[PDB]
């Protein structure tokens, strides 16, 4: 998180290099995040 960026880009995520059994070094999906961090990233709330 970086509050100095404009709203929309003030929270970002770097995805894991390996999830379950897929090698996600390059192919990263927008739904890999768990539901709680998904909510925090989409800014439905304020507390992580």
């Amino acid at each position: 998180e970086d509050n100095k960026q404009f709203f929309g880009r003030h929270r970002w995520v770097i995805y894991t290099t390996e999830m379950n059994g897929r090698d996600t070094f390059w192919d990263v999906d927008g739904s890999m995040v768990p539901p709680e961090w998904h909510r925090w990233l989409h800014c439905m709330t304020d507390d992580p």
Binding site: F6, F7, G8, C43, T45, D46, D47
Partner: protein, 97 residues
């Protein structure tokens, strides 16, 4: 935001308007995503007395349309659907662009 002082002046003279005065991006000036609980009002018909649905029944006050004239059944002045509409007044805030 974050911009070089040279770039700020370059944009300001190129655009002709102070861009930093009204930025197009949101920087912490928006409302917090988490807000305190609200309390909506109840309404006018949440009284516990003198409140019978008979006296506030909107649907039941509708009536079949009035039959002005049906074929089955001095000098009157000619009439109009309504008095003629008044001429619009020219705007005082900005009469001409």
């Amino acid at each position: 935001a974050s911009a070089t002082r040279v770039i700020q002046l370059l944009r300001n003279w190129a655009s002709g308007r102070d861009l930093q005065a009204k930025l197009q991006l949101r920087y912490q000036e928006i409302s917090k995503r988490t807000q305190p609980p609200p309390k909506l009002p109840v309404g006018p018909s949440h009284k516990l007395s003198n409140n019978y649905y008979c006296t506030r029944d909107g649907r039941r006050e509708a009536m079949p349309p009035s039959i002005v004239m049906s074929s089955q059944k001095t000098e009157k002045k000619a009439v109009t659907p309504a008095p003629p509409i008044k001429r619009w007044e020219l705007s005082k805030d900005q009469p001409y662009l």
